[PDB]
Amino acid sequence: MHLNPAEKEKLQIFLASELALKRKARGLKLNYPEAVAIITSFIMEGARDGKTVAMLMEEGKHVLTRDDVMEGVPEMIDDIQAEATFPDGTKLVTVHNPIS
């Protein structure tokens, strides 16, 4: 596979997102790391799909809403940042205030 250090680490974001998605699907309000994981994995998969950085900066604000998460979680997350390989190489996506 030739996995480098980042590829190994970022597998565990995907895994945490899968965990969190299962918790959401069975009716739980999500906590802080769960919410961060879902939005982060969304961004990295979006890059893999070939979306632009600008698309993801905006889409990232519409993945989870305040009714999906516990009290105070929206205010705990000032931004989420993630890097992934876009068609034009590694880029950084910053999503400000992803959950209103």
């Binding site: 480098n4 250090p5 980042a6 680490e9 970022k10 565990q12 974001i13 945490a16 965990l19 906590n31 802080y32 790391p33 769960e34 961060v36 994981a37 982060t40 516990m70 105070g72 979680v73 705990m76 989420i80 940042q81 993630a82 890097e83 590694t90 950084l92």
Partner: protein, 570 residues
């Protein structure tokens, strides 16, 4: 020009009279004073104040009042106060608490807090900064326990063990000169301060004392090795000669005596009573009465902290595993059951709130959680505010009195008890720069950065392959202070005066900083900061009801805690 309060706090952190919520608790701390000069706040970055000729002095060499490190705009939470200051570090020690910058052009600069060519900067604006936690009940069972401790803000581990041997899985004991030497060498690779306890058991002095001379920093008396009147007596005789502390886990079984017999053997000498409530061990049912005595330094271990609806149900199996007991031996089960009492656990919450139990500790991996001493301290304080109200001592709607009482339990008090408070345990000038930065939203839950001897040792930080350190995954990671030979200069091995005088560090090739254990035998409950209360504690032998000043101490278990499911992935 004037700046409104909200905007000021957002830019520089809070100032006098502002309050901050601790994590998702109901606890609020208030800034008591601020060492700054408004308009001359230090800050670092593009186009900011700490630049040459401006807030950074360009004239002085390092030895001329210049710092190695300035933490700017810290909100300090310490037994000494809750207040706003810059913190200056040099040679690995805190040398100034006050106002840093450049006396060329700024008013009110603390004279030895010059930002110069030699000065690194850590921005603490918007952070709470505390002393590193001092955990004095550590079982050295699994080296993976060190990062667990660092991640919740612990910087010193006192205790014993050789790894996952049954003796160590039960008791905080590194037995005898050879095991002690081996563990001192192991310690060279552990990125945290360490002190090692020998076996406080014997009926002759020499077998016990030779552990102190070998490099132990104290002793543990534990019932699993025989907490007999003789072992108690000989250990305290050794400790009084050597100036080290003795921790005790007493005779739960009451085999050779009741509590009063243990106290008679102690004979007014200083002792640290571990897990004083007794689930973790001790004379059943009344061992918590220890915490009323002037010569006892009492700590709790963490699984009973605080009293919750699931507390009792987890304990039987936990205890059986720790103490190598068998489910098919009725007396093993009876012994275990005798230790587990909602009456004393409920009273333990209240005794903490009253300043009658002075210390917290983990009991890491032997009926305790290595990364939850700090966590459970604040959960206890929060529960007590909810159930008992603000303490009478409070004012301005703040919880500052409670906050000082509780922070002392895991910082200064354990350091005083083990004779190491000259080096660690509080944010004071002249002490080692073991500092923990917390975002208020994560306070007591997950440390931001843990500074050890003036260099960051552990941090919550993101993708090492990214353009900046903030992108995911943000996780706890060892930093440069732990790498190469820097691990030697950023950590202290605490040792007895006799082992130091006898040259044990050179004999073993120890390269870590060597700390001297001292002033352990001349202290008492009166010396426990904000937790100095002595009183007659009565424990009913039939009902386990706990009374202080003729009043039953009881409270309800809670179904939910803060600092819990909002934060943790599992």
């Amino acid at each position: 020009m004037k700046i409104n309060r909200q905007q000021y706090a957002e830019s520089y952190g809070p100032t006098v009279g502002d309050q901050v919520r601790l994590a998702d608790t109901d606890l609020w701390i208030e800034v008591e004073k601020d060492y700054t000069t408004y308009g001359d706040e230090a800050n670092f970055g593009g186009g900011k104040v700490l630049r040459e000729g401006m807030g950074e002095n360009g004239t002085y060499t390092r030895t001329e009042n210049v710092l190695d490190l300035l933490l700017t705009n810290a909100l300090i939470l310490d037994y000494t106060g809750i207040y706003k200051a810059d913190i200056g570090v040099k040679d690995g020690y805190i040398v100034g608490i006050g106002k840093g910058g450049n006396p060329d052009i700024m008013d009110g600069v603390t004279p030895n807090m010059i930002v110069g060519t030699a000065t690194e900067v850590i921005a603490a604006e918007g952070k709470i900064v505390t002393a590193g936690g001092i955990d004095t009940h550590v079982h050295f069972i699994n080296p993976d326990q060190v990062d667990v401790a660092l991640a919740n803000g612990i910087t010193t581990l006192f205790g014993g063990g050789t790894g996952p041997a049954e003796g160590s899985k039960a008791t905080t004991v590194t037995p005898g000169p050879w095991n002690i030497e081996k563990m001192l060498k192991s310690t060279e690779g552990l990125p945290i301060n360490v002190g090692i306890l020998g076996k406080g058991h014997g009926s002759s002095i020499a077998p016990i004392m030779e552990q102190i001379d070998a490099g132990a920093a104290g002793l543990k008396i534990h019932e699993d090795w025989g907490a007999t009147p003789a072992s108690i007596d000989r250990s305290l005789t050794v400790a009084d000669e050597a100036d080290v502390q003795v921790a005790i886990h007493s005779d739960t079984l009451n085999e050779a005596g009741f509590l009063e017999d243990t106290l008679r053997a102690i004979n007014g000498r200083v002792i640290h009573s571990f897990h004083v409530e007794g689930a973790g061990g001790g004379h059943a049912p009344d061992i918590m009465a220890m915490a009323g005595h002037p010569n006892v330094l009492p700590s709790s271990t963490n699984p009973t902290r605080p009293f919750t609806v699931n507390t009792i149900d987890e304990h039987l199996d936990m205890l059986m595993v720790c103490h190598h007991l068998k489910q098919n031996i009725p007396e093993d089960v009876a012994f275990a059951d005798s230790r587990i009492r909602p009456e004393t656990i409920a009273a333990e919450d209240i005794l903490h709130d009253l300043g009658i139990i002075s210390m917290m500790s983990t009991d890491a991996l032997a009926m305790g959680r290595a990364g939850e001493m700090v966590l459970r301290t604040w959960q206890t304080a929060d529960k007590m505010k909810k159930q008992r109200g603000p303490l009478a001592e409070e004012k301005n709607g703040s919880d500052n009195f409670r906050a000082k009482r509780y922070v002392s339990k895991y910082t200064i008090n354990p350091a005083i008890a083990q004779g190491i408070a000259h080096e660690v345990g509080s944010i004071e000038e002249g002490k080692f720069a073991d500092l923990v930065l917390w975002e208020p939203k994560f306070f007591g839950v997950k440390a931001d950065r843990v500074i050890k001897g003036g260099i960051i040792a552990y941090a919550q930080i993101g993708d090492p392959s990214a353009s900046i350190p903030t992108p995911q995954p943000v996780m706890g990671r060892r930093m440069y202070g732990t790498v190469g030979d820097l691990i030697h200069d950023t950590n202290i091995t605490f040792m007895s005066k006799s082992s130091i005088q006898q040259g044990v560090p050179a004999k073993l090739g120890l390269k870590r900083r060597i700390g001297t254990v001292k002033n352990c035998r001349n202290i008492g409950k009166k010396d426990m900061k904000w937790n100095d209360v002595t009183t007659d504690i009565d424990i009913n032998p039939e009902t386990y009801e706990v009374k202080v000043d003729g009043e039953v101490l009881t409270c309800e278990p809670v179904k939910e805690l803060p600092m819990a499911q909002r934060y943790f992935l599992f």
